[PDB]
Amino acid sequence: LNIYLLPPSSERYGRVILDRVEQRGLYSQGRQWQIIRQRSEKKLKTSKSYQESRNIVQEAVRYGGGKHSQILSKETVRRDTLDSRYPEYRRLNEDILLITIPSISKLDKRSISHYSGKLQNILMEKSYKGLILDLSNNTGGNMIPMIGGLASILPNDTLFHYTDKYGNKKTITMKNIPLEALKISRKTINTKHVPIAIITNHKTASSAEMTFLSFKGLPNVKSFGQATAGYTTVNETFMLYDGARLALTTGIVSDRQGYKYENTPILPDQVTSLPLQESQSWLKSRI
């Protein structure tokens, strides 16, 4: 077809990332920020490729956005997509299901609907009186299939809040979740009410942590295990010219109860190295 393309220079490509970082990053203002930015622009003047430009702005991204921010090359983004897994369950006994809820980074509608659908089926069509939700080793990815699959046990209300560098406070509610895309019905939201035990470990991160926050303060819920990884900030992701992605931190976070998080670990209710064990016992007492 009839195509016109005049791709940015490697310098331009680098400067585009600096503009975004400055525009939305939590920390990208003030004396230390320029200097880092100025130093980055000086190197970019002689950059000879996009890859080189990403290397050059790395300090700026890390400073301007913090430890939850980064630039992923197109290749890195795809390899990470291929690490995606689907939820699994095992019946522990006639009353308790153990549900494994893993990392998934996929965007495509089919994959994310298979992930959420698997969860939906377990929660809606299986028999139980209590649940164990296992977020160990879930380092995040696409929030949509995670929150979506768990829709039946979450409020049709505020999930968590987040505030940007300009002091704009916003809210992620069950409505902001594209359930329609997963072909899941809003009539199923919050229709299961059983004791829920949630397990986390040190690797539990990011989307998984914000999924964890979405259960906080629920009276039927209690959590076991260890503090999470501490990537409790909202990111916005910007697709760059060659398919690379800028993941940029733009929001500080608070849960329904008013507690604030800024790349800070979440404490489970009951810290322990035996959370499956203590989980079941807790579930027994409440059943």
Numbering used by the authors: 31 to 317
Please give the exact wording used by the authors of the publication that reports this structure.
In this study, we report the first structure of a nisin resistance protein, NSR from S. agalactiae COH1 (SaNSR). The present study reveals that the lanthionine ring E of nisin determines substrate specificity of the nisin resistance protein (NSR) and contributes to the coordination of the nisin cleavage site at the catalytic center.
We deleted this N-terminal transmembrane helix and included a His8-tag for purification purposes, resulting in soluble expression of SaNSR. We solved the structure by Single Anomalous Dispersion (SAD) phasing, using crystals of selenomethionine-substituted protein (data and refinement statistics are shown in Table 1). The asymmetric unit contained four copies of SaNSR that were virtually identical (root mean square deviation (RMSD) between the monomers = 0.15–0.5 Å over 300 amino acids). A SaNSR monomer consists of eleven helices (α1-α11) and eleven β-strands (βa-βk), which form three domains: an N-terminal helical bundle and two protease subdomains. The presence of N-pep within the tunnel is clearly an induced artifact of the crystallization procedure, since in the full-length SaNSR protein, another 30 amino acids are attached at the N-terminus of the N-pep sequence that form a transmembrane helix. Out of all residues of this helix, only the side chain of Asp110 is intruding into the tunnel, which neither forms an interaction to N-pep in the crystal structure nor in the NSRTail MD simulations. This suggests that the protease cap is not adopting a fully closed state, rather an intermediate state.
